[PDB]
Short mmCIF file of C-alpha atoms in Angstrom, two decimals:
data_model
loop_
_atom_site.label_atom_id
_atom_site.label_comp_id
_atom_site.label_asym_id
_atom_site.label_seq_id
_atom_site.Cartn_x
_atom_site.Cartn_y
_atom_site.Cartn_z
CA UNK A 1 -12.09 -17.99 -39.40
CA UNK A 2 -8.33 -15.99 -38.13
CA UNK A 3 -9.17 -12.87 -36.52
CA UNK A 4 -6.42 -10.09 -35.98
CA UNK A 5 -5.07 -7.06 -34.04
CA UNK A 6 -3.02 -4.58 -34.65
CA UNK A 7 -1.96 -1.31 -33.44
CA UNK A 8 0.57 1.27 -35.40
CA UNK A 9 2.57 3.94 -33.09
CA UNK A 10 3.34 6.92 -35.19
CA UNK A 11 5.62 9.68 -34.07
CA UNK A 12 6.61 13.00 -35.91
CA UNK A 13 9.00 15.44 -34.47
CA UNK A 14 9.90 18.98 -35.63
CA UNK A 15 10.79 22.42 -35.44
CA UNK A 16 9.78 24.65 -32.79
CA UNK A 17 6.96 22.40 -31.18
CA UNK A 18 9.47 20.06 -29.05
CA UNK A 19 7.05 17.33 -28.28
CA UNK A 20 6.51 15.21 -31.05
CA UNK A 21 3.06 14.74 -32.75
CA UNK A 22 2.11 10.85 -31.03
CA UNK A 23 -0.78 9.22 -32.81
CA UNK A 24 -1.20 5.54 -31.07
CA UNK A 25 -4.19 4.10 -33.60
CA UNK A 26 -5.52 0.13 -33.24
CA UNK A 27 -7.19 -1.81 -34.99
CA UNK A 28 -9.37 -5.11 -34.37
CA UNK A 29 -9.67 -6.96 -37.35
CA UNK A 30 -9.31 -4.37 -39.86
CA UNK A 31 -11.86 -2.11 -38.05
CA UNK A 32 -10.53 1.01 -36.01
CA UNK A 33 -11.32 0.32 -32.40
CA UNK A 34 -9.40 2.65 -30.31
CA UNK A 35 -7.33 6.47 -30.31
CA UNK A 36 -4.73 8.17 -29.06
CA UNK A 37 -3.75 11.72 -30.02
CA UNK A 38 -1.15 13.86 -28.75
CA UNK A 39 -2.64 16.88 -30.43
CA UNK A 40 -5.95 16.41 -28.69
CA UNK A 41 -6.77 19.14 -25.66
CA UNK A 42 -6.81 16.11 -23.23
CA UNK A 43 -4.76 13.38 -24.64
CA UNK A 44 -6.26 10.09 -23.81
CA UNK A 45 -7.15 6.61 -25.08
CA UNK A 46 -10.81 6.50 -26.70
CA UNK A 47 -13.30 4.40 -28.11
CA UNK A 48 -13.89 4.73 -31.83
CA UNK A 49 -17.06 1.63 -31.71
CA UNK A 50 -19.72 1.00 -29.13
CA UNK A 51 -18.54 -2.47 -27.98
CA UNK A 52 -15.61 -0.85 -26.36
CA UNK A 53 -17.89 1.56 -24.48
CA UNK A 54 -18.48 -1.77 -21.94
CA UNK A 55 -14.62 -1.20 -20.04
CA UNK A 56 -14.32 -0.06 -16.60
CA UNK A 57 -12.27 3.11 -16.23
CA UNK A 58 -9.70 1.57 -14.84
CA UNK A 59 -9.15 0.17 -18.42
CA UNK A 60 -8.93 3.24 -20.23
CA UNK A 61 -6.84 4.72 -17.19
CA UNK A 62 -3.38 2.77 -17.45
CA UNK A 63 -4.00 2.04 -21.28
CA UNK A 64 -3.69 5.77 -21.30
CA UNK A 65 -0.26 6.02 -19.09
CA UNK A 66 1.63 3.73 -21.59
CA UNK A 67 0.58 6.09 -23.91
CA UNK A 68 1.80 8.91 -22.37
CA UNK A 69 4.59 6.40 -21.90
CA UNK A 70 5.39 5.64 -25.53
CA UNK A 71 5.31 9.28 -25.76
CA UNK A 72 8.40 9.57 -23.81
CA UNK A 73 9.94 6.65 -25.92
CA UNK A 74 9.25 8.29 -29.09
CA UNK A 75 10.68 11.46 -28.05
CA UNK A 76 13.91 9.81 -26.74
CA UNK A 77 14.67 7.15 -29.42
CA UNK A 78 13.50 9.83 -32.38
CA UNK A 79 16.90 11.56 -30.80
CA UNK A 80 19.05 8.68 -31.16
CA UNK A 81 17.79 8.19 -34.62
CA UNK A 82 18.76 11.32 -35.66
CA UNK A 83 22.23 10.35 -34.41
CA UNK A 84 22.93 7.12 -35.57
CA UNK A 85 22.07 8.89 -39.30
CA UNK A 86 24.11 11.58 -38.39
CA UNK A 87 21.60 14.29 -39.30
CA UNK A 88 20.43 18.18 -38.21
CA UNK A 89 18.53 18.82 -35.09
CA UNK A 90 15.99 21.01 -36.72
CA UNK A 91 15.42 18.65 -39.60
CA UNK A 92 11.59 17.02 -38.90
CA UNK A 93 11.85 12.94 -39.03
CA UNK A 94 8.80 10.03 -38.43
CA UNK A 95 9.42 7.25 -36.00
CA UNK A 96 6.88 4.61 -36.33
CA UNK A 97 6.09 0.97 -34.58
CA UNK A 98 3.15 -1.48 -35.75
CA UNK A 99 2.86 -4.40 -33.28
CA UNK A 100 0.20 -7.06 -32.44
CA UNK A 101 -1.53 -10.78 -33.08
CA UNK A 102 -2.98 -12.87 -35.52
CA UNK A 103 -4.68 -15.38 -33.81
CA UNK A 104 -6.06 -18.53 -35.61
CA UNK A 105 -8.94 -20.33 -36.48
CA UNK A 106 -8.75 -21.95 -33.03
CA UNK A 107 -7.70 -18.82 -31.46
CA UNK A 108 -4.01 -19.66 -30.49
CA UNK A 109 -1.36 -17.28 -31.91
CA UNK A 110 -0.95 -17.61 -35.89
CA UNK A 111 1.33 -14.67 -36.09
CA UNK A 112 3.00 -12.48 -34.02
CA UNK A 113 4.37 -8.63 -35.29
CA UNK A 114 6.69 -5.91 -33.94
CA UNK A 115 8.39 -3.53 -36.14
CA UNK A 116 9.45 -0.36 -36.70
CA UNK A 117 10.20 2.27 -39.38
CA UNK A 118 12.07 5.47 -39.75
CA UNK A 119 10.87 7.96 -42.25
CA UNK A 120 8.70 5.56 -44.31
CA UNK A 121 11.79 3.42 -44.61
CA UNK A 122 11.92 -0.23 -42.81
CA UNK A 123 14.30 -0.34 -39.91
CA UNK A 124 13.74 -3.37 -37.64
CA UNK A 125 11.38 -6.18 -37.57
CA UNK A 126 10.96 -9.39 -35.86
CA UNK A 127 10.84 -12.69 -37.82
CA UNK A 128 7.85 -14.78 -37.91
CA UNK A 129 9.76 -17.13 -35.84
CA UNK A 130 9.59 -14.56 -32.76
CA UNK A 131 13.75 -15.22 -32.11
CA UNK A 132 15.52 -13.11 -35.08
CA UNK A 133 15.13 -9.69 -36.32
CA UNK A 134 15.99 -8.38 -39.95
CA UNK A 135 18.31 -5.37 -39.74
CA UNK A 136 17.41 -2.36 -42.51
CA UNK A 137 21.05 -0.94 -43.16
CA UNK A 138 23.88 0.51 -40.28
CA UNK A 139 22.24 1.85 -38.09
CA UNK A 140 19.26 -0.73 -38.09
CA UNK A 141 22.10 -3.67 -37.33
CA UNK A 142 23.36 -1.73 -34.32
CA UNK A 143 19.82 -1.76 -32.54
CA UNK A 144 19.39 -5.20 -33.21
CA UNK A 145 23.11 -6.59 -32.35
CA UNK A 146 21.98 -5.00 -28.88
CA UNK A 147 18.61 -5.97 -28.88
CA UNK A 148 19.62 -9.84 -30.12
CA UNK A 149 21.77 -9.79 -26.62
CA UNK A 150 19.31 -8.47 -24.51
CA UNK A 151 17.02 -11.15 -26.00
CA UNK A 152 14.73 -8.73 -27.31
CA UNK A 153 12.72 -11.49 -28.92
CA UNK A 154 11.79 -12.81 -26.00
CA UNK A 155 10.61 -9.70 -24.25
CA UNK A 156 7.78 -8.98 -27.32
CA UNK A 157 7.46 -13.07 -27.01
CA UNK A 158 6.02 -12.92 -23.76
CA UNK A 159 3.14 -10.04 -25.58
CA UNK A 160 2.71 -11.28 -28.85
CA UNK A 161 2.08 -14.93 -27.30
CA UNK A 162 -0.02 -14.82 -24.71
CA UNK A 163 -0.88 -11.81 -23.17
CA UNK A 164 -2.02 -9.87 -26.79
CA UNK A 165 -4.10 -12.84 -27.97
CA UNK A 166 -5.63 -13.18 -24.53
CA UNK A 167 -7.13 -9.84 -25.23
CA UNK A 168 -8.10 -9.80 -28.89
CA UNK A 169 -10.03 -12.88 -27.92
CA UNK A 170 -11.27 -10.29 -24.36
CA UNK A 171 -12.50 -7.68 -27.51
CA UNK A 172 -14.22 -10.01 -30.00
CA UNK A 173 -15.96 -11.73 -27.03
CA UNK A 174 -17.96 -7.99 -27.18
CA UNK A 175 -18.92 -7.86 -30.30
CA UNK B 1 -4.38 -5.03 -23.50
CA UNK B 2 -0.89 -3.25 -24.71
CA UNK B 3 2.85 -4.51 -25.29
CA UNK B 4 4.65 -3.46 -23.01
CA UNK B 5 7.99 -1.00 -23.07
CA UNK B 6 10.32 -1.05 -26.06
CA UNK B 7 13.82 -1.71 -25.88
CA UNK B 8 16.19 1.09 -26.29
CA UNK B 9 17.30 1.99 -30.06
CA UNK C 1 27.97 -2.42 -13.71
CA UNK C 2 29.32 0.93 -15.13
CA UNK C 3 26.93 3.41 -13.21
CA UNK C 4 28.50 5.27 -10.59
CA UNK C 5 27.13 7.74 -7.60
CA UNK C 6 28.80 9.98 -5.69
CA UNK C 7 29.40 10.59 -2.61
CA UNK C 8 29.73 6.80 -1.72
CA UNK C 9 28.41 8.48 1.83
CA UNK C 10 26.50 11.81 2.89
CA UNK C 11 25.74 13.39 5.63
CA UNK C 12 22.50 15.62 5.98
CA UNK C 13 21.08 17.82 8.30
CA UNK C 14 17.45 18.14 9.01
CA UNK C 15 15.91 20.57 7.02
CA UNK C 16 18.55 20.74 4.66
CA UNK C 17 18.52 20.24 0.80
CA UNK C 18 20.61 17.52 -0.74
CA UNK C 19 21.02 16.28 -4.29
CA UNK C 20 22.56 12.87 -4.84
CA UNK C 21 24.04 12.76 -8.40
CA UNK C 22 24.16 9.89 -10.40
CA UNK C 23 26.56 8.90 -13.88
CA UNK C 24 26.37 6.02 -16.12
CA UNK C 25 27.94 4.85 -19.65
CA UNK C 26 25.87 2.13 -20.36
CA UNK C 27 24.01 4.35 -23.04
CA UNK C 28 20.54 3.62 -21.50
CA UNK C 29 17.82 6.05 -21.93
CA UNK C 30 15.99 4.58 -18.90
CA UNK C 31 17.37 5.59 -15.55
CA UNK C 32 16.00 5.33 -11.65
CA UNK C 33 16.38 5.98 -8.18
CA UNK C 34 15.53 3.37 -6.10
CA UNK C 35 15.59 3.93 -1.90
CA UNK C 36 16.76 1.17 0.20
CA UNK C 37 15.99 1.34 4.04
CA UNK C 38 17.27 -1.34 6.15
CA UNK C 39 18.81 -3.60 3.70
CA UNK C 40 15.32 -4.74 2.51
CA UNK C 41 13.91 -4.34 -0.37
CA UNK C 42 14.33 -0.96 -2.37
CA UNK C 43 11.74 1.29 -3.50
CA UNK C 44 11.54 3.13 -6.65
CA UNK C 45 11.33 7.04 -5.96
CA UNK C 46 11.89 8.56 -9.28
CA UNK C 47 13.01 7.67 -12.70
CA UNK C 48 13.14 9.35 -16.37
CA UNK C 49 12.73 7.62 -19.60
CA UNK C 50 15.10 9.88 -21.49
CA UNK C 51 17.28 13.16 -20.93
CA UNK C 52 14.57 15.84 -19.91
CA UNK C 53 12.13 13.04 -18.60
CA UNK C 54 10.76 12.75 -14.96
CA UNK C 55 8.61 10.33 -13.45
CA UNK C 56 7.08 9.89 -10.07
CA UNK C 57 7.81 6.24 -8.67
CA UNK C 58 5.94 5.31 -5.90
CA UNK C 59 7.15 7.45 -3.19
CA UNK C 60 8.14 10.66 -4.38
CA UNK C 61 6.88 12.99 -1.69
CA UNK C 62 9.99 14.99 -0.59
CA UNK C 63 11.87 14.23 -3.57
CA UNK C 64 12.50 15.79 -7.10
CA UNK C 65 14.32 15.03 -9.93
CA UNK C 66 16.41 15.95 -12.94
CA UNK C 67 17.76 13.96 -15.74
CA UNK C 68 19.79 16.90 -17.56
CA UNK C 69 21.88 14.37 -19.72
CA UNK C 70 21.86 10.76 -20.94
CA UNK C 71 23.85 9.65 -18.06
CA UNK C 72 23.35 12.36 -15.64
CA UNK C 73 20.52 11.63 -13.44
CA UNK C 74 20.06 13.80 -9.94
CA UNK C 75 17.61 12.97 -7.22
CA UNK C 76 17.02 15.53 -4.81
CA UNK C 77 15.82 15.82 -1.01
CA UNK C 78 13.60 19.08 -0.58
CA UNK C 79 14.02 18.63 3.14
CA UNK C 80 16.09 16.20 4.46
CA UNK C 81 14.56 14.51 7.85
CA UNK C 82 15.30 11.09 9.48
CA UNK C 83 12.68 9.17 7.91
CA UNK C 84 14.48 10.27 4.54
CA UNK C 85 17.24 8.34 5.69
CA UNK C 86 18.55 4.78 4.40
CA UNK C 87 20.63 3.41 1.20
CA UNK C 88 19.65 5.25 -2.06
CA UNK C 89 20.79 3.79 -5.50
CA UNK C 90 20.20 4.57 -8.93
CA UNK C 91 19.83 2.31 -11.76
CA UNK C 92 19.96 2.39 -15.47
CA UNK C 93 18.89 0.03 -17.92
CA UNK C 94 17.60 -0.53 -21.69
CA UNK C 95 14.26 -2.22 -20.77
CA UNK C 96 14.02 -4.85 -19.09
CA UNK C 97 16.98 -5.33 -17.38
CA UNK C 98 18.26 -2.99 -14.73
CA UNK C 99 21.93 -2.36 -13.78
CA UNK C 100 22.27 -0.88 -10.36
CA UNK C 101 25.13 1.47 -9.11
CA UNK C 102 27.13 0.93 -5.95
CA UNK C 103 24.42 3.37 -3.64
CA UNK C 104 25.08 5.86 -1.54
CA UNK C 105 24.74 5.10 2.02
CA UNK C 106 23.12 8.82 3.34
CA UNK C 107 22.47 9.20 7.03
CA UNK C 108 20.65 12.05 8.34
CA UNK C 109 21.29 14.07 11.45
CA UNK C 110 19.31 16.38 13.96
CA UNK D 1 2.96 -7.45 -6.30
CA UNK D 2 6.03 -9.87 -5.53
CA UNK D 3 6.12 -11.81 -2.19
CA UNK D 4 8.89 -13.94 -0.44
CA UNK D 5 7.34 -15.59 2.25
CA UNK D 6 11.15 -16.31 4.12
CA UNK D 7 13.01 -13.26 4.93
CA UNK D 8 15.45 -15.43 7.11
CA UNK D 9 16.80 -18.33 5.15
CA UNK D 10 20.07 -20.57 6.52
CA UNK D 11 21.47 -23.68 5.04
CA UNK D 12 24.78 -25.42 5.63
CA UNK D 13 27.48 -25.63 3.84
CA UNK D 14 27.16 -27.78 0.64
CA UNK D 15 23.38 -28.60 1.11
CA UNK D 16 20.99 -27.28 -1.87
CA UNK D 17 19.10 -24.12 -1.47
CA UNK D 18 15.57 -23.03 -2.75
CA UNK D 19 14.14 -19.19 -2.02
CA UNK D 20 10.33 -19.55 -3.03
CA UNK D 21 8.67 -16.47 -4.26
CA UNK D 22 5.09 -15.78 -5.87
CA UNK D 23 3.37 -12.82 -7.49
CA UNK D 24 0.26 -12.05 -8.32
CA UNK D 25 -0.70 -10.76 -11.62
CA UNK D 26 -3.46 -10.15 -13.62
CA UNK D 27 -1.37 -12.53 -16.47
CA UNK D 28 1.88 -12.88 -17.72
CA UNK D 29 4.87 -10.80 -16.37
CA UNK D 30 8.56 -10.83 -16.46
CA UNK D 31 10.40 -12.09 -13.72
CA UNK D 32 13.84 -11.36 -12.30
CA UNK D 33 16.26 -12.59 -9.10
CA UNK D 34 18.74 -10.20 -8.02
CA UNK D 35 21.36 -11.15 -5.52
CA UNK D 36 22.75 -8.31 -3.27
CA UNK D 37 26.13 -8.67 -1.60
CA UNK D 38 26.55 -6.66 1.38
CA UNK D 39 27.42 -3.09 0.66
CA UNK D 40 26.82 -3.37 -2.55
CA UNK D 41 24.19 -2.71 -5.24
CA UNK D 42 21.79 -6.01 -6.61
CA UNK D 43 23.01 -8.18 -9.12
CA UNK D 44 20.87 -9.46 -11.95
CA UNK D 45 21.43 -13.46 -11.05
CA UNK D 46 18.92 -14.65 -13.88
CA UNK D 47 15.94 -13.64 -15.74
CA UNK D 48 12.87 -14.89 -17.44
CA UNK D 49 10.85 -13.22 -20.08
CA UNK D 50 9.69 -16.19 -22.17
CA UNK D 51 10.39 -19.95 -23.16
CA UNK D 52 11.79 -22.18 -21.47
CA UNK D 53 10.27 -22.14 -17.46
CA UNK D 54 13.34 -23.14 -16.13
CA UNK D 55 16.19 -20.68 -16.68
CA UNK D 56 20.22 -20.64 -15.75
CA UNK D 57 21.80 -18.15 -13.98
CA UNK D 58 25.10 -17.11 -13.40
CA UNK D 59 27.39 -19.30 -10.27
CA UNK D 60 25.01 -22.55 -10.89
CA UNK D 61 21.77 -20.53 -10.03
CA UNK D 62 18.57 -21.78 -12.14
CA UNK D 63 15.17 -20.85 -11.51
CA UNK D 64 11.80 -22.31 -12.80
CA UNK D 65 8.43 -20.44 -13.48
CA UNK D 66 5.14 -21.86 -12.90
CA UNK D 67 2.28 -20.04 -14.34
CA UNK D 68 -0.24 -22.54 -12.91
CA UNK D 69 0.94 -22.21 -9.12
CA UNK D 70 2.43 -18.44 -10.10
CA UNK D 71 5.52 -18.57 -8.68
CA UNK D 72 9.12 -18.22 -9.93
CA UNK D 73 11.29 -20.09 -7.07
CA UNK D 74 15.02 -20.19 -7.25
CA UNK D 75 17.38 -22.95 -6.26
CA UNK D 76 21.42 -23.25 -5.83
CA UNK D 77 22.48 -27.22 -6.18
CA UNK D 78 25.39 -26.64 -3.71
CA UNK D 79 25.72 -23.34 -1.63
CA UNK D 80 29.21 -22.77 -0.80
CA UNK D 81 29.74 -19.99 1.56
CA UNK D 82 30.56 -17.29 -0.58
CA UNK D 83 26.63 -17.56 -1.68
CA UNK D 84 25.69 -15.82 1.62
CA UNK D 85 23.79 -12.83 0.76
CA UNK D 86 20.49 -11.34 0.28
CA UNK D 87 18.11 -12.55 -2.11
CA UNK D 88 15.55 -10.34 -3.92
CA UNK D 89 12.44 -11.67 -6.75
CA UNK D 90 11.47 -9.03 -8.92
CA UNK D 91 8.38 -8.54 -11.77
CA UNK D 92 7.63 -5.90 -13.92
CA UNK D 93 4.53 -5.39 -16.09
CA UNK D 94 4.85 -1.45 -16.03
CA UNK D 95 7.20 0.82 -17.68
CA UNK D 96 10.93 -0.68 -17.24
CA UNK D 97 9.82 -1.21 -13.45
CA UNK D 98 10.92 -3.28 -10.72
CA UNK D 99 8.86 -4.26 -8.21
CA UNK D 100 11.24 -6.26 -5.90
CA UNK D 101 10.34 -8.35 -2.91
CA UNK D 102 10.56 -8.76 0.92
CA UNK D 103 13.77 -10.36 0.00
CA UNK D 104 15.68 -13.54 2.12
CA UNK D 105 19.12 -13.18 4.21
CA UNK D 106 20.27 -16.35 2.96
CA UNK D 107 23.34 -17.96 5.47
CA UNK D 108 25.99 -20.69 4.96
CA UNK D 109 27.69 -22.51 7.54
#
């Protein structure tokens, strides 16, 4: 049996609250393992089952700072965004990612994923292959003519191959 | 664990 | 290879404050300052992820920070003394790879 | 963390050159050389985020990763003299880091 893991990045910026609304949700399988809300009093990454009480702090400590990482990601490409559409500052917009592995039956990588929507609409993604991306329209070429140079592929390779799986096999091993 | 950084858009 | 710092060389006085300024058109969004003492290897003192970010590096004590524009990153000495002294350059990049600027080679004096 | 273990390295003219470097991670990281030519900024010589262990750099520089002894060492074929210059081995597993090394005067003849 192919387990899974995912995780899905969602962003929401607005008027008057500058900060945009992060919500970092994953999920093991199809079961909701772990939280992340910008709204919360203490933002911070939390367990949402029992088997992921057994993690050192240390765990939940830098987990949290890419977090408050993507944050900073979210708020700074959700700007750009707005610009390559050419649209008003005040206007409120949604920036999402989705990203993980699909490991398979004998637990090496089936499938790898990275992708990204604006506003509900598809923008980028990365082929199955893990070495081309499928533009959405303008805008969504641009990012990846850059990102096709830089050997984007390649970068979320390194992830999606090894070091994800490596983990999703760390989490089912508690359960 | 979790990917690291995103390239710029 | 398009990020540039000025002055090429400064000259600071103990106790005082000085800001090196930093200016890039490579479009990144992420942007450092890394310190390099003796021609070894350079240390990253501060660095934002996008205009209005600021981020600690690992040796930030006696330094701040301000990334007012894309391209416009200034690091700051709250009180210059000599062990604040040595090669300072600032880097941008678009993940992943990071283009340096030419440094700015700032001596201090007592 | 990165380490070179030779911070002094001299070859002569036209002899190959190799600058060793090792870092120690909990897995898989992404490793860089830059080469810095006095009074100047680094230079990104090559880089290696994932295929292929053995990857080309600019001025016949190649490098080849090792996961099993961890370690990314670089190598020049022929060294003329212009190659004289400081050599620094970078990672980064954090945010758009990098974590550079000790780094190795490397000297022609």
């Amino acid at each position: 049996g192919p387990h899974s893991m995912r995780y899905y990045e969602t962003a929401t910026s607005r008027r008057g609250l500058g900060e945009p609304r992060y919500t970092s949700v994953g999920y093991v399988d199809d079961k909701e393992f772990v939280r992340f809300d910008s709204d919360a009093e203490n933002p911070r990454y939390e367990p949402q089952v029992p088997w992921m009480e057994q993690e050192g702090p240390e765990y939940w400590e830098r987990i949290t700072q890419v977090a408050k990482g993507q944050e900073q990601w979210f708020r700074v490409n959700l700007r750009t965004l707005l610009g390559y559409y050419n649209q008003s500052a005040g206007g409120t917009h949604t920036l999402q990612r989705m990203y993980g592995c699909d490991v398979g039956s004998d637990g090496r990588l089936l499938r790898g994923y990275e992708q990204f929507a604006y506003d509900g609409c598809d923008y980028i993604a990365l082929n199955e292959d893990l070495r081309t991306w499928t533009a959405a329209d303008m805008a969504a070429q641009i990012t990846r003519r850059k990102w096709e140079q830089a050997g984007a592929a390649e970068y979320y390779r390194a992830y999606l191959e090894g070091e994800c799986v490596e983990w999703l096999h760390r989490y089912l091993k508690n359960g | 664990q979790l990917s690291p950084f995103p390239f710029d858009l | 290879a398009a990020v540039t710092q000025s002055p090429r060389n400064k000259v600071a006085v103990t106790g005082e404050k000085v800001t090196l300024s930093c200016n890039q058109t490579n479009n990144h969004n992420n942007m450092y300052w890394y310190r390099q003492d003796t021609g070894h290897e350079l240390r990253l003192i501060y660095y934002s992820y996008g205009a209005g970010s600021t981020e600690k590096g690992d040796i930030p004590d006696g330094y701040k920070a301000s990334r007012p524009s894309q391209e416009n990153f200034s690091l700051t000495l709250e009180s210059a003394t000599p062990s604040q002294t040595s090669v300072y350059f600032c880097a941008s990049g678009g993940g992943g790879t990071l283009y340096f600027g030419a440094g700015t080679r700032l001596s201090v004096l007592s | 963390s990165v380490t070179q273990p030779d911070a002094r390295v001299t070859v002569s003219e036209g002899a190959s050159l190799q600058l060793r470097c090792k870092y120690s991670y909990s897995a898989t990281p992404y490793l860089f050389w830059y080469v810095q030519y006095p009074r100047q900024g680094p230079q990104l010589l090559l880089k290696y985020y994932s295929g292929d262990p053995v990857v080309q750099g600019v001025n016949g520089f190649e490098a080849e990763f090792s996961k099993s002894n961890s370690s990314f060492h670089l190598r020049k074929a022929s060294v003329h003299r212009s190659d004289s210059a400081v050599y620094f081995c970078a990672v980064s597993l954090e945010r758009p880091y990098l974590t550079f090394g000790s780094g190795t005067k490397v000297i022609v003849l």
